[PDB]
Design a protein around this ligand. Sequence first.
Ligand SMILES: *[C@@H]1O[C@H](CO)[C@@H](O)[C@H](O)[C@H]1NC(C)=O
Lengths: 65, 50
Amino acid sequence: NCTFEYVSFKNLREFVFKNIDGYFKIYSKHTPINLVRDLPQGFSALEPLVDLPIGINITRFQTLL
Amino acid sequence: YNYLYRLFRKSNLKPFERDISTEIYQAGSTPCNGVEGFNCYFPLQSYGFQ
Ligand SMILES: *[C@@H]1O[C@H](CO)[C@@H](O)[C@H](O)[C@H]1NC(C)=O
């Protein structure tokens, strides 16, 4: 175990996570916002960060805070 | 006997899938529930290279 390791309101912060063929892939974006009642309509496309050779099955997730 | 292969699994691997799980496989009517027997098998086996 412990087989892999790496080291690198005002905002809406947006992320995407997906897994394909045992690779795992991440995208994100960050912006100021006018109002906080609901997600604001418009465009600001997300862009890639990391692509990891994990070789693992993912079916569940949780937020850490 | 240090080298091993999986002789039994529930379903075939996806591309580059890897699986360390050791639980007893069931091949028929017998409720195996953690032990070997008729249609009940330990999933990892050795080539015994000589
Ligand atoms: C991941 O493993 C679980 C538990 O064995 C299984 O239900 C699931 O089908 C597997 N994932 C995929 C994408 O098939």
